[PDB]
Design an enzyme around this catalytic site. Sequence first.
Site, PDB file in Angstrom:
ATOM      1  N   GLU A 163      22.785   0.475  27.806  1.00 47.04           N
ATOM      2  CA  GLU A 163      22.058  -0.706  27.275  1.00 47.04           C
ATOM      3  C   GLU A 163      22.986  -1.490  26.349  1.00 47.04           C
ATOM      4  O   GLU A 163      23.023  -2.697  26.366  1.00 47.04           O
ATOM      5  CB  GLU A 163      20.819  -0.283  26.550  1.00 47.04           C
ATOM      6  CG  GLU A 163      19.689   0.176  27.493  1.00 47.04           C
ATOM      7  CD  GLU A 163      19.131  -0.936  28.358  1.00 47.04           C
ATOM      8  OE1 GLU A 163      19.464  -2.166  28.206  1.00 47.04           O
ATOM      9  OE2 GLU A 163      18.418  -0.630  29.362  1.00 47.04           O
TER      10      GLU A 163
ATOM     11  N   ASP B  37      16.909  -9.206  24.140  1.00 46.06           N
ATOM     12  CA  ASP B  37      16.941  -7.763  23.902  1.00 46.06           C
ATOM     13  C   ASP B  37      17.851  -7.476  22.693  1.00 46.06           C
ATOM     14  O   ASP B  37      18.888  -8.073  22.538  1.00 46.06           O
ATOM     15  CB  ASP B  37      17.540  -7.047  25.100  1.00 46.06           C
ATOM     16  CG  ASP B  37      16.693  -7.215  26.363  1.00 46.06           C
ATOM     17  OD1 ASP B  37      15.508  -7.398  26.313  1.00 46.06           O
ATOM     18  OD2 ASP B  37      17.244  -6.996  27.424  1.00 46.06           O
TER      19      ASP B  37
ATOM     20  N   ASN C 104      17.460 -13.015  27.861  1.00 43.48           N
ATOM     21  CA  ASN C 104      16.872 -12.963  29.190  1.00 43.48           C
ATOM     22  C   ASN C 104      16.494 -14.322  29.718  1.00 43.48           C
ATOM     23  O   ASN C 104      16.313 -15.269  28.986  1.00 43.48           O
ATOM     24  CB  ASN C 104      15.635 -12.054  29.114  1.00 43.48           C
ATOM     25  CG  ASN C 104      15.932 -10.666  28.478  1.00 43.48           C
ATOM     26  OD1 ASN C 104      15.274 -10.212  27.516  1.00 43.48           O
ATOM     27  ND2 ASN C 104      16.939 -10.037  28.984  1.00 43.48           N
TER      28      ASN C 104
END
EC number: 3.2.1.17
Length: 129
Positions: free
Chosen positions: A35, A52, A46
């Site tokens: 990640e 994120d 995004n």
Amino acid sequence: KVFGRCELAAAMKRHGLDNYRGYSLGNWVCAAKFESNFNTQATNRNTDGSTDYGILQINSRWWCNDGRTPGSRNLCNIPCSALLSSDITASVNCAKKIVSDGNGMNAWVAWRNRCKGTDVQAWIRGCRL
Ligand SMILES: [Cl-]
Ligand SMILES: [Cl-]
Ligand SMILES: [Cl-]
Ligand SMILES: [Cl-]
Ligand SMILES: [Cl-]
Ligand SMILES: [Cl-]
Ligand code: NA
């Protein structure tokens, strides 16, 4: 902060991720590697306009407030910036909520694609825990 592999494993263990909803510690360290590359400061936009945040790439659509994701929720009741701290407490506590939601660690795309079904114990090998 950019953690080392074992340093992050210890931090995750101490904050109660090891076997949390039945996901062994390797799954969490593997998820963090792919990640964020173990970087608490990681951010990624995004397509939907959400972002994120942090070591586990927690999304502002649902989980945290960043002030720029309209019509989103903040189920972890935190500013997304909290997820970027060198102290991973906020990230871990919010990850516990995510994983509890119904879809397990499939909530993390990198976990599903790069960790799920793999030898995740490799991620905690050699670590003093
Ligand atoms: Cl380390
Ligand atoms: Cl493991
Ligand atoms: Cl955003
Ligand atoms: Cl907030
Ligand atoms: Cl920590
Ligand atoms: Cl599950
Ligand atoms: Na939000």
